[PDB]
Design a protein around this ligand. Structure first.
Ligand SMILES: Nc1ncnc2c1ncn2[C@@H]1O[C@H](COP(=O)(O)OP(=O)(O)NP(=O)(O)O)[C@@H](O)[C@H]1O
Ligand SMILES: Nc1ncnc2c1ncn2[C@@H]1O[C@H](COP(=O)(O)OP(=O)(O)NP(=O)(O)O)[C@@H](O)[C@H]1O
Ligand SMILES: Nc1ncnc2c1ncn2[C@@H]1O[C@H](COP(=O)(O)OP(=O)(O)NP(=O)(O)O)[C@@H](O)[C@H]1O
Ligand SMILES: [Mg+2]
Ligand SMILES: [Mg+2]
Ligand SMILES: [Mg+2]
Ligand SMILES: [Mg+2]
Lengths: 315, 315, 315
């Protein structure tokens, strides 16, 4: 979370720092995580200044061989924010892991925003209470925030509804460029504080609605790859749990029977590879719904029944 | 909800603003919520000028990060329509939301046009403690307008006649192109007049013969996705309760119904997702059509009967 | 395998040695394998114009007529690293042998990087067993370096998890120069001990035109050619095995093609002839995935049945 200004005092001229700040770079770790040509292609001064600023940034940040001994040791501090249901939390090995993209998707009324609200609430719980003790974020691309649901959720854990609402940041995503710019703002908006959770509800709704077509608007895949890359950059530099959610699309080929039903996630492989944890939700009966692990390099696929009660997710 | 009154003189000349006005955007908010692609695609618009007017429109509005307490301060004045049935007020919980898209659907003879006309009449009057004297927009394609049951129904409301008749705007599209293309004229029309509701009735009835068959499906679902995203933008801009009613299609597969719900709503995952609440309707006995909460971000799952008779909705 | 330490202060002094070490080439064979244009173009201080010593130092390179019997006997008892599944080891006569490039690709659910961790863990197994008896490297820009993979696979073959912890030199970084520099000090940690594996797993992404229209160059093709160039030069010099993983891109068969195999590799012709062994991963019913070969000089087309469980990969 070290800012750009920390680079300035270590033998860096103010022009480069101010250009970096204006361009949307707020963390020296992010610069050390940035491609050389990307930093070069800003104004023109950084073109000849890259060979010095990159070394100045890397002299502090350890980017050599973070051996698996150190990686496992730093894996201990991973919060694994709770889910809301004991079944979901246990099936997720203690809950939703932090520092990674943990996209979930499903058909309508699968509880995507319900789990989003429960996460935005329970990430503020103390560490022993199933949370990161952090301040939540929420980037909704449709407006279904429903903060009254947050208040109702806040009652179950005994946390006061007075501060769980002021401990949540909100932002309306209106297009793809708005998504990227809001993420840029969130970069310097969580830099000073401990934020344990980042929400983007329907990270792909605007991609699907705006970049519509084949070929005519299939630069969307490069755009979405860039966006998911920036989410992973944030989740690495800050340790924040990115919990973007995704919609689904139908299989219309001659067959009717398919793996995981005709309903398969949208985005293609740009979003499938750049998504470490992937949960597929379906509809059961009444409140009950079933969760299945679609893609995760650490979990076995199974079923966990979570019911959308009067206070979020639980049983 | 602020029309184009400052874009024409925001340093940027009024000429490219005229191009924007004729190309589809008639307000500051729609451009601010717009991405760069839709405007660079416009003829006569350069990339740099597009970036300039995008930054201008963005800095015009907040489009940023606000605390959820401010969102509640915005939520306390949600102008929900006054639903005609008391038990319906106890299930819809105040009527119909302000930022939303309602999808009340069901088979033939299930009371989906009376709700359209009663929701058109209501909120034009400051009764039931419902302020915000607004209008209605009956945008019909199936042929369920009937502007005589419309005027002869303001009896329980008791609001005289022909003022509702001139207080409702009506357009009768026939193809899916018309229903989407008239939304621009709708917004350009009530950008200056306060509207509390926009009804497009059987909007998904057009996506049944207009783009007919498999192999013509992808274009149809793309068109519907753009139509619904445009609804989202209108609702998030003007803050109105926009209403769609959905047809049904049988499921001739013979499986996964167990003699229950042998009918799915027309439209696929394109519509199931971009709809805040959806209300299943099934016809009971005599004139008591029944209801159910298919989904809603906050409203709980609850079956609830209702009834129909002359003058429209009721107990 | 290692520099013979004879050219220091002999034709090229230690100062010029550092001048050439600026751009890698620490083993004498590595310097000899470099074009003279690059060696004469390093820095103003590092002109090194009179640098023909690398050619007269032909005693180090194995150039010359060497009996094919020596090659046959050296690779007859070659080190093969098993995948943990007998059927996988039966589709292939090892084919993982140390000293070539092993590329895999497939859909997301099939376990592209699942077997990479397994091979890295079992790479420590003795020579007569299915491993190189070393501390295999690893680089993962994707970030999917989950530790339970390392521990469970070690437990599968009856091994301590602490050994595999410090037996893998993980690294991480988004920028491409990061990967290149990692491969630059890859020699500097090649020198001291024996590992016989240099997995690089994920390939770094890049950012392209965000506001400036659509379509662009990348130079990724020559970057990937150079990257695989260091890969195979390291493999040949050190007698080590190089492993990469490849994303899958579909829609290539959308031009009136029967689309039997629409999932095409990324990388064009650069990935094709810079690679010797290529493998295809196909998703099966649940955990029952099937392994395939695109093209190998000494392999037919074979399929095997393999599964993934809690303790690694196996049936
Ligand atoms: N208080 C409550 N009591 C019982 N059930 C509830 C309650 N609140 C919500 N639900 C149910 O839980 C569902 C969750 O839906 P939601 O979380 O919006 O799904 P989604 O897939 O995110 N929505 P969309 O993608 O727009 O179709 C609701 O639609 C109701 O069916
Ligand atoms: N404990 C486990 N038991 C069984 N299967 C598992 C287990 N952990 C992971 N898997 C499977 O491994 C799959 C992912 O394999 P992985 O090696 O991560 O593929 P990848 O293509 O590298 N992933 P991505 O980068 O998201 O495209 C999951 O979707 C599961 O099917
Ligand atoms: N006893 C009655 N006398 C007169 N009208 C009645 C009576 N009972 C119900 N209705 C009418 O029934 C209507 C309910 O809508 P519905 O019968 O579904 O219309 P529709 O035109 O068939 N709908 P759709 O084809 O789905 O657009 C109301 O508008 C009432 O006016
Ligand atoms: Mg949901
Ligand atoms: Mg009707
Ligand atoms: Mg693998
Ligand atoms: Mg071959």
């Amino acid at each position: 979370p070290q800012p750009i200004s920390r680079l300035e005092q270590c033998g860096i001229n103010a022009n480069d720092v101010k250009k970096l700040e204006e361009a949307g770079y707020h963390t020296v770790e992010a610069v050390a995580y940035a491609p050389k040509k990307e930093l070069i292609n800003i104004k023109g001064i950084s073109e000849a200044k890259a060979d010095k600023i990159l070394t100045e940034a890397a002299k502090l940040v350890p980017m050599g061989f973070t051996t698996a001994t150190e990686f496992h040791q730093r894996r201990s501090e991973i919060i694994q924010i709770t889910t809301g249901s004991k079944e979901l939390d246990k099936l997720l090995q203690g809950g939703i892991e932090t520092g990674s993209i943990t996209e979930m998707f499903g058909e309508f009324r699968t509880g995507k925003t319900q789990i989003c609200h429960t996460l935005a609430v329970t990430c503020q719980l103390p560490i022993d209470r199933g949370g990161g003790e952090g301040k939540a974020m929420y980037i909704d691309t449709e407006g279904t925030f429903r903060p009254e649901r947050l208040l109702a959720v806040a009652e179950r854990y005994g946390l006061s509804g007075s501060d769980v609402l002021d401990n949540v940041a909100y932002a309306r995503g209106f297009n793809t460029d708005h998504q990227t710019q809001l993420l840029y703002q969130a970069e310097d908006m969580m830099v000073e504080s401990r934020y344990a959770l980042l929400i983007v509800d329907s990270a792909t709704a605007l991609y699907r609605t705006d970049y519509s077509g084949r070929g005519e608007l299939s630069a969307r895949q490069m755009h979405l790859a860039r966006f998911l890359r920036m989410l992973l950059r944030l989740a690495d530099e800050f340790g924040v749990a990115v919990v973007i959610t995704n919609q689904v699309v139908a299989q219309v080929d001659g067959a009717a029977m398919f793996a995981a039903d005709p309903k398969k996630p949208i985005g293609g492989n740009i979003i499938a590879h750049a998504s470490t944890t992937r949960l597929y939700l379906r509809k059961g009966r009444g409140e009950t719904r079933i969760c299945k692990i679609y893609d995760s390099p650490c979990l076995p696929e199974a079923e966990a029944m979570f019911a959308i009660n009067a206070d979020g997710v639980g049983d």
